[PDB]
Design a protein around this ligand. Structure first.
Ligand SMILES: NC(=O)c1ccc[n+]([C@@H]2O[C@H](COP(=O)([O-])OP(=O)(O)OC[C@H]3O[C@@H](n4cnc5c(N)ncnc54)[C@H](OP(=O)(O)O)[C@@H]3O)[C@@H](O)[C@H]2O)c1
Ligand SMILES: O=C(O)COc1cc(F)ccc1C(=S)NCc1ccc(Br)cc1F
Length: 316
């Protein structure tokens, strides 16, 4: 199929990108270099991952080497929860731009819908371990994001981990100037997100699927959690196509018209994950993979469940 999807701003976003959460600073530079060489043109970043400077070094080297031109790359970062206050949004964006060594971002996302107390700590906690919320509401944060488009810092703005009521709040904002281009959410065969995806797609919002392999390096993994990569039913579908299970898990969201951003720092796996354009899962394989849904979420956090804007109390 097409390798890019059209956003509501007229820009084309590559459907496969490289994730960078948990990529150590001493390895992410090489990872990104190898990815660009092999053909990736979309990199998913965030300030909170604490490695944007090192991503930036990789991007600059490949621009300087003339392997790629800036306009061919699609670089995404995210506004952290401690910067939801209207006056802090621009500064947070500029810090990211400085670390990545760029003069504009292609897409800037609100990372989570919940605002936290501003400060140096990414997760400010109270004396009993609850996250300290800020009194900012998401509509005011959105207005600040829209000003970054007008100022030329970012080409498109979007959201991440927003449920459908939270998306609706933005779409019904008085004076809405730029609709969200993308909603980046957790999506894989154990959390298929049919309802939320259909909602978003109906509204012309592109969905990006994160943790498509089930994030087996997540820091809070437990020894007897489910493993997608070792699910024997998925292994059988892979075997039938002579692909790896990872390749099947990456191709899956592509055929649902989603963008997908697997993470790897391993050069062989970076190349393997890119070889997904030469095969098709059947309708039958797609429906079967959808049937494996268990509403199991990698990305959730108990310390934040008391926040009024925590997204996962809703059905979708
Ligand atoms: N918006 C948000 O809230 C949100 C939250 C979570 C994730 N994200 C984004 O989504 C990206 C992807 O999600 P994720 O990092 O949670 O995990 P993921 O991409 O589902 O899985 C990463 C794990 O899979 C391993 N892996 C990669 N390709 C493989 C292959 N071909 N065979 C076997 N193992 C393979 C990686 O190993 P190696 O690295 O050792 O090779 C790593 O341990 C993140 O990096 C981040 O950019 C955004
Ligand atoms: O968030 C990422 O992209 C990947 O995850 C993270 C990435 C980081 F670099 C630091 C913490 C997280 C965590 S703990 N994310 C879980 C989480 C954070 C805030 C809220 Br509201 C709910 C929630 F579930």
């Amino acid at each position: 199929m097409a390798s890019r999807l059209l956003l509501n701003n007229g820009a084309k976003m590559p459907i496969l990108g490289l994730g960078t959460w948990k990529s150590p600073p001493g390895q992410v530079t090489e990872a990104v270099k190898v990815a660009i060489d092999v053909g990736y043109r979309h990199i998913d970043c965030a300030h909170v991952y604490q490695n944007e400077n090192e991503v930036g070094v990789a991007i600059q080297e490949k621009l300087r080497e003339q392997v790629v031109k800036r306009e061919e790359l699609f670089i995404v970062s995210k506004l952290w929860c401690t910067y939801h206050e209207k006056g802090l949004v621009k500064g947070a964006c500029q810090k990211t731009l400085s670390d990545l060594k760029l003069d504009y971002l292609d897409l800037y996302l609100i990372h989570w819908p919940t605002g936290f107390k501003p400060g140096k700590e990414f997760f400010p906690l109270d004396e009993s371990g609850n996250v300290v919320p800020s009194d900012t509401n998401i509509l005011d944060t959105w207005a600040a994001m829209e000003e970054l488009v007008d100022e030329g810092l970012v080409k498109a703005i979007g959201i991440s981990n927003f449920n459908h009521l939270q998306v609706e709040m933005i779409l019904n904002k008085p004076g809405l100037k730029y609709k969200p281009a993308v909603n980046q959410i957790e999506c894989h065969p154990y959390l298929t997100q049919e309802k939320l995806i259909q909602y978003c797609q109906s509204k012309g919002i592109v969905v990006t699927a994160y943790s498509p392999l089930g994030s087996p390096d997540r820091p809070w993994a437990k020894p007897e959690d489910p493993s997608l990569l070792e699910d024997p039913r998925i292994k059988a579908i892979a075997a039938k196509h002579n692909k790896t299970t990872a390749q099947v898990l990456i191709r899956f969201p592509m055929q649902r018209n989603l963008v997908v951003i697997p993470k790897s720092v391993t050069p062989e796996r970076i190349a393997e994950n890119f070889k997904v354009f030469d095969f098709e899962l059947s309708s039958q394989d797609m429906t079967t993979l959808l049937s494996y849904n268990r509403n199991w979420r990698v990305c959730a956090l108990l310390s934040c469940t008391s926040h009024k804007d925590y997204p996962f109390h809703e059905e979708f």
